[PDB]
Design a protein around this ligand. Sequence first.
Ligand SMILES: C[C@H]1CCCC(=O)CCC/C=C/c2cc(O)cc(O)c2C(=O)N1
Ligand SMILES: C[C@H]1CCCC(=O)CCC/C=C/c2cc(O)cc(O)c2C(=O)N1
Lengths: 306, 309
Amino acid sequence: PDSRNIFVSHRFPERQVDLGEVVMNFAEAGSPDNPALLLLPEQTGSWWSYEPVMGLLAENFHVFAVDIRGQGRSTWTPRRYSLDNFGNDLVRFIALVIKRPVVVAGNSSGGLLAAWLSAYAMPGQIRAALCEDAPFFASELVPAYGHSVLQAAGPAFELYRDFLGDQWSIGDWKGFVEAAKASPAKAMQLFPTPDEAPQNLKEYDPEWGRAFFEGTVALHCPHDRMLSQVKTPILITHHARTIDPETGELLGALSDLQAEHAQDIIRSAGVRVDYQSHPDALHMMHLFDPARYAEILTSWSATLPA
Amino acid sequence: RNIFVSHRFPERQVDLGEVVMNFAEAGSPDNPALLLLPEQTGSWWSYEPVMGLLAENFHVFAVDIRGQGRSTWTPRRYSLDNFGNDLVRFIALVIKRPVVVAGNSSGGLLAAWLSAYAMPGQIRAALCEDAPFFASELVPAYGHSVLQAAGPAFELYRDFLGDQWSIGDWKGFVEAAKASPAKAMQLFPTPDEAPQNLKEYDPEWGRAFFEGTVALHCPHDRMLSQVKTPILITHHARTIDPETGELLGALSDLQAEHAQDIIRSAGVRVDYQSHPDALHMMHLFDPARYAEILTSWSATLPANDHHHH
Ligand SMILES: C[C@H]1CCCC(=O)CCC/C=C/c2cc(O)cc(O)c2C(=O)N1
Ligand SMILES: C[C@H]1CCCC(=O)CCC/C=C/c2cc(O)cc(O)c2C(=O)N1
């Protein structure tokens, strides 16, 4: 994987654009007369996390699915992984490639960035943001509310750092898998441990995981302040989540309490916010139940002002 | 936040999205565009005495960086990357042409930031006026850290003025400054009343430098390795105290030598001028000299003719 020559074929053509520091890879679907839709993957996911759902969304949207920096065919940038750098790359992407206002939809950390764009993009760039099971608060080191990253997804990111290493400099996949299987963190059960590293992980810069676990990725983007600054309608979907009865760990993206405060803050900013709890859905609904995801996204987007 | 004073160039503001950025414009768009970045604690009008000279030959934009002047104060969001992307947006939304960027001190850091990290084609060239490469980092690759240079002053901005002037203990700041063991404290204003520039300054800037958060995600050795335009480095007064080892000045000879080396190994044009008797803010305290440095160097840039009309 530190070859950066490990890529495979996909169903939609891919194109790259120079944003200045990062060269961003992306795939396009749908017809350009339809409203623009920017799709942001989960951490460890390339644009083609959205490949099964892109055909469905192609019926109604002009779809751009991107590799975020440090993922896929987009530039890996050591020591530069922050929500602000991720977000400003996407501001540049809209300005250089799309050149229209977008609906932005993001899963997990991509949902953090969907909110980031609502608050901090260039004026007019963002019509609305869909935050698909975004770990508001629970992906911070010291959140204003609820479980920290250390008490939720952190243990997996720690193992990415310790065994895969920055830019796959260590690459001990077998040691990662044996450490993951031996971990006493119940949340580890939500992460794949196949016999060989899966394609999405070979495209992933594990310094992402370091930055989340060490609390550097969002040091300059406290979530309570970010959510208070959003400027567009927001849709929050909230998928599976439980509190482990033996460790107290959060299993899922964010707890009910965290979701309640996220809504409250957005509402206090005076922007439209809608919340949908889908407690039996998997974290990556856009991948594992694309028809349900597409319906949610399409139906909501139809309620947006023109 | 209503302590502003008049100035001899009209000021305007532009919404960048998060930051509303204040700036002063002078000159004709027929001449090359020039973006002026102040030092930390300096508003755009740090350049007000020299802009008349520069407006003879340049279309000048002098800006208030986020957390300074009339530009939005943004609690907890002070980083070189956020400062830098604001300026990327400013060029894209206001200037709409390639620019020469000239910055003093932290503004010089940001000029190099733009050279490396702006959108393609935005930056023609960067003038880094006594920029504290390495010396303004918490863990620099080379030489003094901020803790052995300007840090003690920023520490006192944090401790006595506070984030967004939330403490505001100017008297106690002055008293602590005078009592400081740091020889470098003599380089900072300690008047009996807070000066105008500092009333316009968000001291969380100082916190961010002292605590090593402002450039956590922008190590300077890597930044300098990624520059993509010609760079002019001016290096003004500096000495290293023989008793404490403190750096008095923006950067040491060792730090300037590595900065040059790194830029040159990026394969771009780099020029270095040592002005060991110049004050840190030469653009303010020796404006005629500074204007001649910038103008004469700009005239040697490729496409200087294309940018005249
Ligand atoms: C890798 C991606 C895969 C999801 C693995 C899980 O289903 C665990 C529960 C959901 C939380 C994930 C999660 C937390 C976080 O604090 C930061 C992140 O980027 C994610 C994030 O993107 N996970
Ligand atoms: C306040 C402004 C003016 C104070 C200048 C001095 O006379 C001290 C000399 C060294 C440079 C300061 C300096 C260091 C740094 O690590 C980061 C910075 O932004 C400055 C910076 O902009 N100083």
